[PDB]
């Protein structure tokens, strides 16, 4: 996260970091608690993992430094992927965890609602991307988990920041118009969390852009709200 600051504990309680164990343990991507067994975050976070063997999901964590040999973590059953989706460019950027074991609910640790299908036409104005991912285009993960909250942008003027790209319905883009606060590398698969009527909704997640933070270049997301049938196909599946 660029132009953001620490989080405090328990604030942002869906919040995951996901990490690799291939070749070496390391942070991964975010993600985001949404059910008792179910992390949602980006495809293209699983480029090249070729089995969910070598995950680890690490919730109620504030700290990277938190994270021991001997801290508990939850193991991926399996991995799921929108079957549309080809590069986080072309958008379909949703994959689904399903955790080996069940997530216990508390102050720690719970999950984020999904919106609404009648709220897609909802004005949120109080959104947040939060993250372990680098503060500056060459930079580290961060140690402490990070916030910034950033206005939402219309496709239309998104799609003006982004010649010769496609932006969709299916994405939906965060920025200020002379940058300095935005998602930037090791955020991706994180949550763009936004409250409306004392609700927090996971609204976006953190998918591409151009450099981190830039004039003119917002950040781009999943656009959550377009994906609530397809989670609930895979969630609720007999
Ligand atoms: C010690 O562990 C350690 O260093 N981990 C670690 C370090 C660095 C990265 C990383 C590097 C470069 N790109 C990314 C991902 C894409 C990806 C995801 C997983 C694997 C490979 C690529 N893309 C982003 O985050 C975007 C989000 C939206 C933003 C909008 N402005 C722009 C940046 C991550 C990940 C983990």
Redesign the pocket.
């Known amino acids: 996260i660029v132009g953001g600051t620490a989080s405090v504990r328990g604030e942002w309680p869906w919040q995951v970091t996901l990490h690799t164990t291939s070749p070496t343990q390391?942070?991964?991507?975010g993600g985001s608690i949404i059910g008792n067994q179910w992390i949602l975050t980006?495809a293209?976070?699983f480029?090249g993992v070729e089995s969910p063997k070598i995950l680890r999901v690490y919730s109620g964590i504030l700290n990277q430094s938190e994270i021991k040999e001997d801290t508990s973590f939850f193991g991926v059953q399996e991995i799921i992927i929108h079957d549309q989706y080809k590069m986080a460019e072309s958008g379909y950027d949703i994959a689904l965890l399903k955790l080996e074991t069940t997530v216990g609910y508390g102050d720690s640790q719970r999950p984020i609602c999904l919106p609404s299908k009648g709220d897609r036409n909802v004005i949120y104005t109080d959104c947040w991307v939060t993250g372990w991912?680098?503060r500056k285009l060459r930079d580290?993960?961060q140690n402490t988990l990070q916030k910034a909250k950033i206005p939402l942008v219309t496709n239309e003027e998104c799609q003006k920041r982004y010649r010769g790209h496609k932006i969709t319905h299916k994405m939906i883009c965060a920025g200020y118009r002379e940058g300095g606060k935005?998602?930037?590398?090791?955020?991706?698969?994180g949550p763009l969390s936004c409250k409306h009527n004392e609700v927090w909704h996971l609204v976006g997640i953190?998918?591409?852009?151009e450099?981190?933070?830039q004039r003119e270049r917002p950040?781009?997301y999943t656009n959550v709200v377009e994906y609530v049938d397809w989670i609930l196909e895979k969630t609720q599946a007999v």
């Open positions: 390391r942070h991964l991507c980006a293209h976070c480029y991912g680098y580290k993960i935005d998602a930037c590398k090791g955020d991706s698969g953190t998918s591409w852009g450099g981190c933070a950040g781009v």
